[PDB]
Design a binder for these strands. Structure first.
Lengths: 380, 62, 132
RNA sequence: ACGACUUUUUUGCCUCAGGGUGCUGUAAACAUGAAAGUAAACUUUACGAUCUGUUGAGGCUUAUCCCUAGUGGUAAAGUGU
RNA sequence: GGGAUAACUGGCUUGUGGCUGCCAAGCGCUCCUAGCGACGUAGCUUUUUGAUCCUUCGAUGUCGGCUCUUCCUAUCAUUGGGACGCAGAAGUCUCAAAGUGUCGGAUUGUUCACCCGCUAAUAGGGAACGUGAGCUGGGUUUAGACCGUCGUGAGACAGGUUAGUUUUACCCUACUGAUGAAUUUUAUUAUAUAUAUACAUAUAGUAUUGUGACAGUAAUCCAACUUGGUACGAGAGGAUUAGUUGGUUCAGACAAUUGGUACAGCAAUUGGUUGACAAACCAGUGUUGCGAAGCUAAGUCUGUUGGAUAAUGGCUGAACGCCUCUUAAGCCAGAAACCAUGCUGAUUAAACAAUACUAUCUUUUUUGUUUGCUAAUGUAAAAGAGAAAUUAUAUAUGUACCGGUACAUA
């Protein structure tokens, strides 16, 4: 018989299996689509989540209850070392999907790039990319010509520069980035000219843009159904347990109907967060990088005592509105929206009033060490 | 221009960190910490608080 | 009158006993139901400051006993985040009785009133001794 | 859970130590300092919970904190192809 | 002893229940049918109760609730409509629709029922009468006991009441997560220098980048205000439609910042103990106060638009000189439905592509393949394994002129 009282099912069926991701690096499912009128440009970037801060922002929001008045908001900080392009990928459309024709490489590569292939860099003779050290420039040109002629999608093989970071890892993350815009020839000219250079996030993105965020979630191992799916807890009276499972269900199917909640992995899942606004694209050489029109005071983005488990910011950085999937220290993938967002909020231009640089370890009030010293005074 | 002062200490009030209590008397009390909040809850006067800057001032040690 | 209201943290389950805060002659209000409350198996009916509840008078005038009357919450024990960047909370829980057409049944709101709620319901802003 | 996964293996890493960041709340020690009174000399000398001073003192802070090319360390030498 | 025979499912049937009809005497001012619809009469169904006794009595755990998921539609609301007895506002009958939602209590052993209240509305059912190695044990229904009635009595009572053990997963499968070889009777959407070429390619081993068939799927509803006290209305009243701002529910993350959290850690303190003393210890965490940090919500962020269409509204337009949305051909716009897109998985494809480096070895020719082993053999298909216009089909292909015209040819 039917249930007496109705009540929505626990959790989404559409994110079965609730299992571990097979890569640390975020995986872009799909890229931005055709726009021949637009000039060629990069679609994506990897950067590392350093932590969270809060902001004070002045609000326009027409007809709002808050309206004109200022708001305080949480924000994420992502240190972004410039990615380096090392390869060109030429893909061609088939009724079996996109297929690679060939890849064309740069005329030298990083040690950090080579480290990703080696499992035992320390105990090896490091012979990778040494027959493929060089070939005739004619061969390269022929491959480029071939790709222009036959390929219909261009991706650039890019890689991270972890040597510009405090992290334990020295292996680069290597990555394809689709190039979206004009003709394949115009694109090819664009990637070739760009190639060996380093790409700041400011070269890829503009402040105020809405951005799509691709990351693996924070782990937790294998967890019970209550934790995993949020079902109503067992009664005070039971034969056994309280985080112990409900009924599985009907005699027909004469099998477990798969839609039932179950114990198993929780977190370390791949996930796309959508439409996060860029509040500031920071500059490495700016010593005023946390300051605002209201503040106008020399002051770097780095918190008091730095970010938890990451410390100082020493490269360029993205100040992003709101939450981001995964642990601090994790690589995070930024992608442009597949169709550009059109909204009030998308169009809008942020005016910060304050960026916090207080401690995130304890309740350390001070923006600067100098302020802390100034408060306390003489010491022994 | 820049944010208001703590008054339980010399400190500026940095946002988010502070909470606000409105008493039956119509009096607001602004707290910069849980530790400050607990002291207020236990209703213990400043003149017993050896750690705090107000005490140091009260005993003229500034 | 705009009746729009940015989110305030859920509070006061039904069966809560809150101060009546006026010269109505009510001393307390026992909230038995919330007006506008969502459908859900799990939830008790729960009310913030700006919510219209339905209450009965447990201590107060004899006619007011038994009978059901609307109220608006003015003082609240549970903290909420104001967007100005601080968490506000009151010492006590209190509301003031009103009509189902939202007309005031009180005469003068003796405690303080949350400012967003006072500007929410005009007749309370009028009657209120202080704005929080 | 265990496999598995992420790493690094001398432009490192571990180790301690220092600094940063904090957390606790003013250590022991000493005052012929203060202290409700007490007793014993011929005004001085004893006893005394406590409190103040020296004293934002002393302690603790990677274990899943931050920084440091600051100290000493950094083996087995196996197995599959 | 008994499924030779009840109480439990299932099964046949559908009296009874429920649902849908057909009709046309009346009702509906007036008016058969806007809405109705008798007297009559046809079906459908088994969420009813029966009839039953085929199945099971060397046992299918006997009600209900809780919890949890899925399916149905005979749609209550949300989406699009049609009709109206319709001025608007409403509201009422109705169709495509199962995408989405459908609540808090009071009283019960309770399906059911019945109040009070919210709601946006508080639709109806299936899943062994959904769901006892998921729970619970209140109830019918063991053995104790009580009262009434009936029985001479012992006792009896779908008469009422109180008290009364709910045993086992370590098997197989299923499902959820976690590892993981192996696969030339197998593959190939191309490869090679504007031209070739399956009588052809493809070692393997590590490692990166990916391909993406296929499988899953998600976001949701309301309010307020402005439109507007306007249209419309005699007045009273009083919208569609957008727009803006908010809130509910679900989902996915995250912890800056509030709250919550202590056998990280400092201080305090009770009882005892080490002569005092600092130092300390002990009491299954002695007990307080604070408590970074890591978790966490009652805290914070984020949650697409195309295509093909349905109901339907229409068009051109015959049959049938006129007419006709096609109840012919030809068409068009059109929904929370549908399929993509999006997003998740993809040792769900015994799948695969590109790249990097490497293993005394690769390539051509000759002879051989009638202590576990140490020269070595297998083919599902040789017999000329011969054959690359193309839209076609109530006409095609060239060639010549400017997708059209002309002229040849099958």
């Amino acid at each position: 018989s039917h249930r007496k009282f109705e009540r929505p099912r626990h959790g989404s069926l559409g994110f079965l299996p609730r299992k571990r991701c097979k890569r640390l690096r975020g995986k872009i499912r799909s890229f931005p689509k055709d726009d021949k009128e637009k000039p060629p440009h990069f679609t994506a970037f990897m950067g590392y989540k350093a932590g969270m801060t809060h902001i004070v922002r002045e609000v326009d929001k027409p007809g709002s209850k808050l309206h004109k008045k200022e708001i305080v908001e949480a924000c994420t900080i992502i240190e972004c070392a410039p990615m380096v392009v090392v390869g060109i990928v030429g893909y061609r459309e088939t009724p079996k999907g996109l297929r690679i024709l060939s890849t064309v490489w740069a005329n030298h590569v990083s040690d950090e790039f080579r480290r990703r292939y080696y499992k035992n860099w320390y105990k090896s003779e490091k012979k990778a990319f040494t027959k493929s050290l060089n070939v005739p420039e004619a061969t390269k040109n022929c491959l480029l010509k071939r790709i222009e002629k036959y390929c219909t999608v261009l991706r650039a093989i890019c890689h991270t520069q972890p040597s510009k970071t405090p992290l334990r890892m020295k292996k680069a993350h290597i990555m394809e980035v689709q190039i979206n815009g004009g003709s394949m020839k115009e694109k090819l000219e664009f990637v070739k000219e760009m190639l060996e250079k380093n790409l700041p996030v400011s070269t890829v993105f503009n402040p105020n843009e809405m951005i799509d965020v691709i990351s693996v979630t924070k782990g937790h191992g294998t967890k019970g159904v209550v934790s995993r799916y949020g079902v109503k807890r067992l009664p005070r009276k039971t034969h056994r347990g309280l985080r112990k499972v409900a009924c599985i269900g009907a005699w027909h199917p004469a099998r477990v109907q798969f839609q039932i909640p179950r114990h198993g992995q929780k977190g370390y899942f791949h996930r796309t967060e959508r439409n996060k606004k860029i509040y500031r694209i920071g500059l490495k050489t700016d010593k005023n990088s946390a300051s605002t029109d209201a503040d106008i005071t020399e002051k770097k983005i780095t918190p008091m005592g730095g970010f938890p488990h990451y410390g100082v910011v020493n490269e360029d950085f993205l100040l992003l509105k709101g939450c981001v999937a995964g642990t601090k220290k994790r690589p995070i993938t930024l992608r442009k929206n597949i169709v550009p967002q059109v909204s009030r909020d998308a169009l809008a231009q942020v005016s910060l009033k304050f960026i916090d640089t207080s401690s995130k370890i304890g309740h350390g009030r001070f923006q600067t060490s100098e302020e802390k010293v100034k408060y306390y005074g003489p010491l022994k | 221009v820049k944010t208001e002062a703590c008054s339980f200490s010399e400190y500026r009030i940095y946002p988010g960190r502070g909470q606000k209590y409105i008493a039956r008397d119509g009096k607001v009390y602004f707290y910069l910490s849980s530790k400050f909040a607990s002291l207020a809850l236990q209703k213990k006067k400043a003149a017993k608080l050896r750690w705090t800057q107000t005490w140091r001032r009260n005993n003229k040690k500034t | 009158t705009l009746k729009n209201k940015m989110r305030i943290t859920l509070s006061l389950p039904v069966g809560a006993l809150i101060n009546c805060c006026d010269n109505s002659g009510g001393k307390n209000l026992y909230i038995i139901a919330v007006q506008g409350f969502g459908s859900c198996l799990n939830r008790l009916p729960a009310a913030s400051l700006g919510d219209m509840v339905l209450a009965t008078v447990k201590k107060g005038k004899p006619d007011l006993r038994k009978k059901v009357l609307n109220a608006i919450i003015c003082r609240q024990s549970k903290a909420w985040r104001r967007h100005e960047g601080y968490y506000i909370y009151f010492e006590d829980n209190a509301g003031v009785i009103v009509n189902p057409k939202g007309e005031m049944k009180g005469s003068a709101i003796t405690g303080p009133v949350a400012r967003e709620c006072a500007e929410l319901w005009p007749k309370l802003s009028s009657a209120a001794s202080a704005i929080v």
